Amino acid sequence: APTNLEQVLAAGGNTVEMLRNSQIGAYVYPVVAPEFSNWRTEQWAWRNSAVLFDQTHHMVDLYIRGKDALKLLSDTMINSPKGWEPNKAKQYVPVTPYGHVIGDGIIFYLAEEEFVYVGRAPAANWLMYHAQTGGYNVDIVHDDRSPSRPMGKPVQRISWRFQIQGPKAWDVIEKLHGGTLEKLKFFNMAEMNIAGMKIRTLRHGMAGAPGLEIWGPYETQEKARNAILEAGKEFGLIPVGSRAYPSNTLESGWIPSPLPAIYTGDKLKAYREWLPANSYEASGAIGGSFVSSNIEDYYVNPYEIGYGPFVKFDHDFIGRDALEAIDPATQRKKVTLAWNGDDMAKIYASLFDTEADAHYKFFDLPLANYANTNADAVLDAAGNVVGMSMFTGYSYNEKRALSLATIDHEIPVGTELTVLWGEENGGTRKTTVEPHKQMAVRAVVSPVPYSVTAR
Amino acid sequence: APTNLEQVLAAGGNTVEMLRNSQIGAYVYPVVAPEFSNWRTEQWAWRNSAVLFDQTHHMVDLYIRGKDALKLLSDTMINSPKGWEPNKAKQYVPVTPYGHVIGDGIIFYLAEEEFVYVGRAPAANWLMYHAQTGGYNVDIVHDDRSPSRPMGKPVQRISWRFQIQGPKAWDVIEKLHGGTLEKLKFFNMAEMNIAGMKIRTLRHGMAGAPGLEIWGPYETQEKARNAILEAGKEFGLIPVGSRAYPSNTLESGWIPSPLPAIYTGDKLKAYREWLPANSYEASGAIGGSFVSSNIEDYYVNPYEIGYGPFVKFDHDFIGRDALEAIDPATQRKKVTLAWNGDDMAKIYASLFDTEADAHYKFFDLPLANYANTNADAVLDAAGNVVGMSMFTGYSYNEKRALSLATIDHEIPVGTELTVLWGEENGGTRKTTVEPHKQMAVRAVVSPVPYSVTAR
C-alpha cells in the first residue's frame, strides 16, 4: 500500500530498527566481472603499475540541461559556484536544511546549460526532487545504475565511464593519445585521443600519481576498452574487477556511504512524500555495531567526513544557516583506522573452530561491508563512543584491514581505539548477516588518505 | 598460427609447464549472481531448509538426436547400456584407449533417439569428435556454457536447469505440484506441475534428503523460478548464488575437475588435431603443489575418483581392454580430507602480517580453487606423495575446510596426512596466483560423502 517514504515510515515502526533489519541484501557493484586476474594482484597494480577501473555500472547518472541547471546546483550545493565554467567538475555535496549530508557525487560542467551528475542514488534523488517541484526551468534524464543481479538480461547505459590510474597511468594515457598530454589541475576537463576518437577527460589521480577519468557514448565502450588494454600491456596495465574496485577508497579516503539524512525534520517531509517506497532511502539497509533508537544519531555533517573545505558561504544554498552555526574546529574528523592484525587473525580463526558456540562476524575480502550504510561504533579505552566507522575492508598493498571513520576531533593520530565489529544479540535480520558474536577490534588512528602510523 | 591442440603442444614446450602457467584466469561459474543473501546462509539452507540451485549457466549442453545416438554413447562410455530406456539418466563417464578419465556429465535419455549431455566441456568435446569423425548417423546441437564475463551483453541458453534440494525440498516440490509426487529411484525421470506447466524432472538429492533437478525451454525460466521462490517461502527456501553453489560438492563428494587425459598417446593424436586451439583442453590451467614433468602423472582412471561401480564389461567401449587390465582393489580411492583448523587459521593470519617476507596462498571462501584442474600433492608422515587433492574449499555447515582427493588405497580413514598448499618458487604465472609461500596443511582422511572422523 505505501507509495512513498513517508508512508513507509508511518507504517514501519522505529526507523532505525527498519533500516537495520532491511531485507534488501548486499550493496552490489554490478555487471563488471568480480575478478579479471585476482583481487590481490588487481589491488597491487593500482599502486605498482596501471589499472583500468570500469565505472560504467555502479553509479546513477543525471543529465541536467536548461536555463536553470546551474541555479539548481548552486541552490542545493555547499560548494562555491563562483567562477564555475564548462570543463571543470566539482564534488557536489548537498546538505539538508538541518546541515546534514544527503549524499555526494561528481558534477561535470560539460557546456553552457549542460551538466551531468554521477554518484550514488541519494544526491541524484535530491536533485530530481528540486528540479521537479522547485520551479526550475530544467530538463533531467535519469540513467539508473545497472541492475544488481542482471541474471543474463542485457544491460544498457547512456555513457561508459573508465579511469586509468596507477604510477604508470600517464605513460599509458600518452601512448593512447599519440603524444604528450598536459596534466591539468585536479578535476579540470579536456580531451584525448583513443583509437581515433575524441574522448573527454577529467584530471584525476591516486597514491601520488596523476590519472584520468574518461567517458563516452555507450556504443564506443568496447572500442575504447580494447585500445586501453592493448596500449597498456607495455606498462603492465590490468583491468580491475568489481570485487577489488570498491576497496580502493580505503586507501584513497573517500567515504561513499553517508546515511541520507532525510528521515526526520518537518522541512524534509515534502521530500519524504516524494521519495518512492522502493527508493534507496526507503528500501536500503544500515549495518554494524552502532545502536541508537534515534535515526539522527546516524547523520553526518560535511565537516565530519572531510567536506569542510568545500563549504563556501558565497551563495544561497539549502542548509547554509545551519552550517554557519557550526564551529568547524569542534567537529568530528575523518580518519583512517588501522585494524590490528592479531585481532584480524582471531576473527578469521573463529570460522574454523568446530566446537565454539559462535564465531566472529564474517569479514569479507577485500570489502567487508554488509549494507548500503555502514555504522560501527568506535570506542575509547573507557568504553565511550567516540566515533563512527563507515567503510571497512582490506588492502593487499598494506597487508592491513582498514576502515574510514569519523571521530572526536581531539583524538591524536597514533591513538589506539577499538571498533566494535559485529552486531548485537546474534545479529540483525539482514540477509547479509550470519549468526555471530561481537569483537572489539583494536584500531590505530591514522591519517586520511591512509599512511602507516606507529602506535 | 596454431589452430588445434596438437599444434599448440608442438609449439608450446613442456605440456605441464604450459598448463601450470596458463593465462586463462579463474574457472568461473557464470552469470548467476554471486550471492542472493550471503554464501554462509546459502550453504546452511541446503542442509537445514531448502534451496534453489540455478544450474542454467555453468555447463555445456549437447543435444544428441538420431539413429546412432545410443550407439555413440554406448561406444564411448564405461557405463552399462543394457536395459537403458527413455526417462532414465546416467552419469556418462568416457575413458581414453589408455583407460584414463576424459571427463563426465549427465546424459538424459529423453525419448527414442533423443539424448542431452550436460556437463563440463571435455566430455562434450569427446562426444562431438566421435559424432563428427566416427561415421555416426546422428545430429548434434552444441549449446555452450555461458560467457565467463558477459559484461552486460545478453545471455541465452536453449534450456534452463534448476535443482530444488534440502531437507524441505520435497515439501516445496509437492506444494508446487499441487499434491503428492512419487519419489522415483535415483536418476529416474518424470514430470511435475509448476504454475500450470508440465516440467520434466530428474530424481536427485543430497545430505540424506530427496530432491529434483528440473528443466525447460529458456523462455519459461522466470515463470518457473518465481513460482518456486514463492511456494518455497513457507519452507524457508532461498536461492543459492554462484559463490556458494560449487562448494556444495565438497559435502556431496563429486570431483568435477579431472584433467582430460588426452595430451599423450598415439591413439589420441587424431583427437588432439581436432580439438581447437582455444578449447578447454588447450587454453585451460592446472594449479596446485603437485609437480611432475610428465602430464600423464596428472591423469586419473575411473576407479580412482569413484566411478569404479559404473564400469560394466557388457558392451564394447573405448578403453575397455585397459580397464579390464586394471586391478580395482589396488587403485587409489576417492576420500574427503578434513583440513586442520589451526593450520587454516595460520594460513589466513599471514594475510595480516605487515613484516613477513611472504604469506601463505590465499584460500578463497567458500571455494578456494584457482584453475580449471586442481592438483595438490598429498604427503604421508615420511614425505612420500600418496595422493592428489583435486577440489578445495570450506563448509559453513561443518566449520571446516575440506578437499576431495584420491589417495593410496591402503590408507585408513582417520589417518592424518598433509596437503601441500600453494605452489613452488613463489607461485606459477597464472593470473589467479599472487606471490606466496607454501604450507603443509594437516588433513584427516574422512569418508566421501564427508562425515566427521576422529583422528
UniProtKB/Swiss-Prot annotation, chains A, B:
Enzyme Commission number, as recorded: 2.1.1.341
List of residues binding substrate: Y29, H58, R120, Y245, P246, S247, N248
Record: residues binding (6S)-5,6,7,8-tetrahydrofolate: Q55, Q91, V118, Q163, E213, W254
Catalytic activity: vanillate + (6S)-5,6,7,8-tetrahydrofolate = (6S)-5-methyl-5,6,7,8-tetrahydrofolate + 3,4-dihydroxybenzoate; 3-O-methylgallate + (6S)-5,6,7,8-tetrahydrofolate = 3,4,5-trihydroxybenzoate + (6S)-5-methyl-5,6,7,8-tetrahydrofolate
Thermal properties of activity per the entry: Optimum temperature is 30 degrees Celsius with vanillate as substrate.
Residues marked Important for activity (site): H58, Y245
Record-level Gene Ontology MF annotations: methyltransferase activity
Subunit and partners: Homodimer.
Stated family: Belongs to the GcvT family.
Protein name: Vanillate/3-O-methylgallate O-demethylase
